[PDB]
Write a protein that binds this DNA or RNA. Structure first.
Length: 269
DNA sequence: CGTCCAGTCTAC
DNA sequence: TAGACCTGGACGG
């Protein structure tokens, strides 16, 4: 996911788990190289927040739950295919690598971290990844300032399309978003990043917030009340640039495809 | 059958 | 920097 997907995933955990109690251990699949979660409680609640391209779960035992335990926080990065599903315990999807089991009474469910390609990670601290800048959705002013006060950084020597994937400065922006942001302003993707940002000290940094916010406001992205194909219709409709007919595409220097209209820009391959 | 395509992370 | 990390779906032969 990108920032929107991580944000909706955290909203899904919050609404779906609002009225559930979990019990027992946190089960990791055998094949996952991520760490075992050392956590057990007779009764705990699960809640979530997103920052950029990370999601933090908090495991919160109820009063008197046993064995005595403090709340535990886990931070997830989703990679290409990470997600959360709430499923009936004996219909686990394939590639459910981390499971949280509801406690009785009621229908026995599992909250699953599901990750086909296993690019996703999680860590035992609750800490956000040091080096990631502020969330473009939830920390706009901090995000904007952190870019504008570090324009000398060699990160801004690169093309604007490459700079926009640098999670030190645009935590939450990924490949579809960089195409959608740059198309809204018709900024050539291979313009020098420092050139587009010096010109700023509704601009590019504001759309780094408002464009991803639009996706959040659509809802869906796997987390909606509407069907899987229904939310996917709404998203494909909203996209104006990414993989759309009549648009150009090039490989950036890490081989990631950038979609654009018109002038590729000066630093183009 | 085969190829190609869809965000870090780490060893050069 | 360039390759590694993975699975599956679309498409070509």
């Amino acid at each position: 996911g990108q920032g929107p997907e991580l944000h909706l995933a955290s909203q899904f955990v919050n609404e779906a788990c609002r009225a559930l109690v979990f019990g027992g251990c946190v089960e990791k699949s055998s094949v996952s190289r991520n760490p075992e979660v050392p956590f057990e409680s007779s009764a705990y609640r699960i809640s979530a927040s997103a920052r950029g391209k990370e999601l933090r779960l908090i495991l919160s035992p109820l009063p008197g739950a046993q064995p005595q335990q403090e709340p535990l926080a886990l931070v997830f990065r989703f990679g290409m295919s990470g997600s959360f599903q709430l499923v009936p315990r004996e219909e686990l999807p394939r590639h459910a690598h981390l499971r949280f089991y509801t406690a009785p009474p009621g229908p026995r469910l599992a909250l699953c971290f599901v990750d086909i390609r296993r690019f996703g990670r999680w860590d035992l601290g609750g800490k956000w990844q040091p080096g990631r800048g502020p969330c473009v959705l939830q920390e706009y002013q901090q995000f904007r300032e952190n870019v504008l006060r570090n324009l000398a950084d060699k990160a801004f020597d690169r093309p604007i399309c490459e700079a926009l994937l640098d999670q030190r400065f645009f935590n939450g922006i990924g490949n579809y978003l960089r195409a959608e942001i740059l198309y809204r302003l018709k900024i050539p993707p291979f313009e020098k990043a420092r050139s587009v940002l010096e010109a700023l000290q509704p601009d590019l940094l504001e759309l780094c917030h408002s464009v991803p916010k639009e996706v959040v406001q659509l809802g869906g992205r796997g987390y909606g009340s509407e069907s899987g194909e229904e939310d996917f219709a709404a998203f494909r409709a909203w996209l104006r640039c990414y993989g759309m007919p009549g648009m150009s595409s090039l490989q950036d220097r890490h081989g990631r495809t950038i979609w654009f209209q018109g002038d590729p820009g000066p630093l183009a391959p």
